[PDB]
Swiss-Prot record:
<protein>
    <recommendedName>
        <fullName>WD repeat-containing protein 5</fullName>
    </recommendedName>
</protein>
<comment type="similarity">
    <text>Belongs to the WD repeat WDR5/wds family.</text>
</comment>
<dbReference type="GO" id="GO:0140672">
    <property type="term" value="C:ATAC complex"/>
</dbReference>
<keyword id="KW-0007">Acetylation</keyword>
<comment type="function">
    <text>Contributes to histone modification. May position the N-terminus of histone H3 for efficient trimethylation at 'Lys-4'. As part of the MLL1/MLL complex it is involved in methylation and dimethylation at 'Lys-4' of histone H3. H3 'Lys-4' methylation represents a specific tag for epigenetic transcriptional activation. As part of the NSL complex it may be involved in acetylation of nucleosomal histone H4 on several lysine residues. May regulate osteoblasts differentiation.</text>
</comment>
<dbReference type="InterPro" id="IPR020472">
    <property type="entry name" value="G-protein_beta_WD-40_rep"/>
</dbReference>
<feature type="site" description="Important for interaction with histone H3">
    <location>
        <position position="293"/>
    </location>
</feature>
<feature type="repeat" description="WD 1">
    <location>
        <begin position="14"/>
        <end position="53"/>
    </location>
</feature>
<dbReference type="GO" id="GO:0044545">
    <property type="term" value="C:NSL complex"/>
</dbReference>
<keyword id="KW-0805">Transcription regulation</keyword>
<dbReference type="GO" id="GO:0045995">
    <property type="term" value="P:regulation of embryonic development"/>
</dbReference>
<dbReference type="GO" id="GO:0051726">
    <property type="term" value="P:regulation of cell cycle"/>
</dbReference>
<dbReference type="GO" id="GO:0045722">
    <property type="term" value="P:positive regulation of gluconeogenesis"/>
</dbReference>
<dbReference type="GO" id="GO:0048188">
    <property type="term" value="C:Set1C/COMPASS complex"/>
</dbReference>
<dbReference type="GO" id="GO:0000123">
    <property type="term" value="C:histone acetyltransferase complex"/>
</dbReference>
<dbReference type="Pfam" id="PF25175">
    <property type="entry name" value="Beta-prop_WDR5"/>
</dbReference>
<keyword id="KW-0853">WD repeat</keyword>
Amino acid sequence: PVKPNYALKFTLAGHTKAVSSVKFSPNGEWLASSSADKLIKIWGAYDGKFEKTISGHKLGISDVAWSSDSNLLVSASDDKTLKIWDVSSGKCLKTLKGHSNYVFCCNFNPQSNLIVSGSFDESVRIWDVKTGKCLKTLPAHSDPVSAVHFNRDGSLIVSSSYDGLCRIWDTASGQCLKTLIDDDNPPVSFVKFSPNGKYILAATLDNTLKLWDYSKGKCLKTYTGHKNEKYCIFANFSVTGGKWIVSGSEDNLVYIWNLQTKEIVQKLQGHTDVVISTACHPTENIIASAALENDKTIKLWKSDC
Ligand SMILES: FC(F)(F)c1ccc(-c2nnn[nH]2)cc1
C-alpha cells in the first residue's frame, strides 16, 4: 500500500468542552476520552457507541491512559491530582497526590504496577499503583512537562518539555540517562517510544515531528506539512497495516505520513477545530481523532490497509 484509505465511520458526541485525549484499550474493545469538562467517557471501539461516563475530578482533565489488562484507567487533571479508576465499576481506587500544579500527562508501565506523570510544576513522578504512593520525584525539566512514556520493558521513561529537551530516565533508580538536543531546541510538545523501543518520536512547536535513534542520539526522520505551533498534540505509530506516522494538526486535519519516505499519504477532513489527539487501534486499521472546543467531537476512521 503506497497509501492507506481511512474513511469516516462514526462521529461521537457528548463532551461539553474541548476533548483533550483519546486512547484505545489494549484489548481493542474500548475507547476512552478525557475532557476539559472534567469527565472521562468510554465508547465502543468498533461501533462508536457511548458506554459510560466516569466522574470525580474537580477540574479539567488533560490525559487518560489504560492499564495493560484493559481493566484500569489513570487520569491527569488541573486539580493537581491523578486518579486510578476501575473501569467496570467506575470506582476511583486511588487519588495520587503530590504535584504542586496541573498534571498534564500520564501512562502505566507495561507490567502496570507503576504510573508515570508529568506536570506544569516541571517534575516527573513515578507512583505505585497498588498503594497509590509516590515512589520518586524527578527534577526533570525547567518548564512544564508535556509528555511521559515507558518503553517496551518498562526500564526506561522518556519525558519532554517546553524547555526544548527530551530526557530519558532509568525507572528503577531515577537517574537521568540521556538528554536529546538538536541543532535548535523549540518547545517539545509530545514524545513517545516506538513500539520496538528503539526509537523516539518527538513533536516540536515549529510544525515538526522528529524520529530519534536515542541510543545513538541522532535524529533520523523528519515529518512536516501539518500545523503545530501552540498545542500538545499526540502523535502515533500505526503498525497494523502499512507503517505510518499519524498526528493531529491545528488546521483541523488528521495527517498521515509514510514512516520510511516521510511523505504525506493522507489528510483526513471532517473536524471543525484543532485536532488535539489521535490514537491507533491495537489490532485493526482504525484511527480515533478528537477536537477542541469549537468542535467537541470524536471521530472513528477505518482503512482497508
Ligand atoms: F527505520 C525506521 F524507519 F526508522 C523505523 C523506525 C521505527 C520502527 C519501528 N518499528 N516498530 N517500532 N518502531 C521501524 C523502523
